[PDB]
Amino acid sequence: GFQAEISQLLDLIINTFYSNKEIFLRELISNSSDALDKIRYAALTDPSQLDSEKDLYIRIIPNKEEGTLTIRDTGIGMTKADLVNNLGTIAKSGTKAFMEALSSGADISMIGQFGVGFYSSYLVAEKVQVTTKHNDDEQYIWESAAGGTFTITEDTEGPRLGRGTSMKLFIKEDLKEYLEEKRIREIVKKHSEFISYPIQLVVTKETE
Numbered sequence: 001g002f003q004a005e006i007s008q009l010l011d012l013i014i015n016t017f018y019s020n021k022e023i024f025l026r027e028l029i030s031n032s033s034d035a036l037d038k039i040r041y042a043a044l045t046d047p048s049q050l051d052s053e054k055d056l057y058i059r060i061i062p063n064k065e066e067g068t069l070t071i072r073d074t075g076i077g078m079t080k081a082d083l084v085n086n087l088g089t090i091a092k093s094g095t096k097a098f099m100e101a102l103s104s105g106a107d108i109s110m111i112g113q114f115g116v117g118f119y120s121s122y123l124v125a126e127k128v129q130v131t132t133k134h135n136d137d138e139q140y141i142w143e144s145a146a147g148g149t150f151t152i153t154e155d156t157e158g159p160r161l162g163r164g165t166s167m168k169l170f171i172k173e174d175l176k177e178y179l180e181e182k183r184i185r186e187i188v189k190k191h192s193e194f195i196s197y198p199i200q201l202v203v204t205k206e207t208e
């Protein structure tokens, strides 16, 4: 497909035009919140939809040894067909919409309106590992790196999500401030006041 070129294009453009890198976390939390809204609504008519995971929440897990920041939610998750549609039709179409808004001088502050908000993670990450699990399907993993072509793979080696999506961001070397507890908490409190789901952070005792 065109993930190699799209990821390269959006990596370059997004890092060029969004100097406030901390909005990557706003986009992650907003997308998690939408996925959680989706399973919450589905559970109204089929309560058994929550059998996979009863709790609706967003959890942030930094790993300084690995250099990763993981945002996991217990939202509706993505089927393989959902993920394929994101990588194909949505990425191509939203890149066009984003680039035309960029070109026409239109306001592009809310990048998620173009359907490519996923790529705002390149503000701080050089690679994103997507794990996702929808009630109708198996757990899948897909990796995004600029210029890469990665096949969607059935994830049998990973920890079970139960249900939802986990975005694991491999943070660029100069930007490890985004793994720090106090920095994460300021950003969430600034950019996610109106989120109606618990936002959790794993804090680890430090040596020393």
Ligand SMILES: Cc1ccccc1-c1cc(Nc2cc(O)cc(O)c2C(=O)N2Cc3ccccc3C2)n(C)n1
Pocket: 027, 028, 029, 031, 032, 034, 035, 036, 038, 073, 075, 076, 077, 078, 086, 087, 090, 091, 115, 116, 117, 118, 130, 132, 164, 165, 167
């Ligand atoms: C990965 C990718 C590559 C290329 C283009 C786009 C994407 C791509 C993938 C996603 N999905 C998620 C991103 C997240 O940060 C967190 C999530 O929980 C999800 C998710 O599972 N849903 C399911 C669903 C159901 C209803 C409404 C909203 C959502 C979001 N979004 C928005 N965008």
Ligand SMILES: [Cl-]
Pocket: 059, 061, 072
């Ligand atoms: Cl966890």
